[PDB]
């Protein structure tokens, strides 16, 4: 999918440097960020199920 080009809206602290970043078109829900337990949107539970094209970090 396309990644929109823009600054991150919520900077966690004051003075955080604004940087042009790759961004999802819609902010992912907090349940979609977690890996071990899936959510209603995606039922994957590990990086094998997600099937990332690139190597992880």
């Amino acid at each position: 999918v396309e990644y929109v080009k823009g600054y991150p809206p919520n900077s966690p602290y004051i003075g955080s440097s604004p940087t042009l970043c790759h961004l999802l078109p819609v902010k992912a829900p907090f349940c979609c960020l977690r890996l071990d337990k899936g959510c209603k949107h995606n039922s994957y539970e590990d990086a094998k199920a997600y099937g990332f094209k690139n190597k992880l970090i």
């Binding site: 080009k5 823009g6 919520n10 042009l20």
Partner: protein, 42 residues
């Protein structure tokens, strides 16, 4: 669009701290749901 955000970089980099702080509270009021108006020195 690469020619459009080239000035967004130049504007967001030169904003004063008073503008950065003002942009922080207003954004939070937007997130918590309070009206952004009414926010607007010793």
């Amino acid at each position: 669009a690469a020619e459009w955000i080239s000035q967004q970089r130049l504007s967001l980099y030169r904003r004063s701290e008073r503008q950065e702080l003002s942009e922080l509270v207003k954004n939070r009021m937007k997130h918590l749901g309070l009206p952004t108006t009414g926010y607007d020195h010793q």
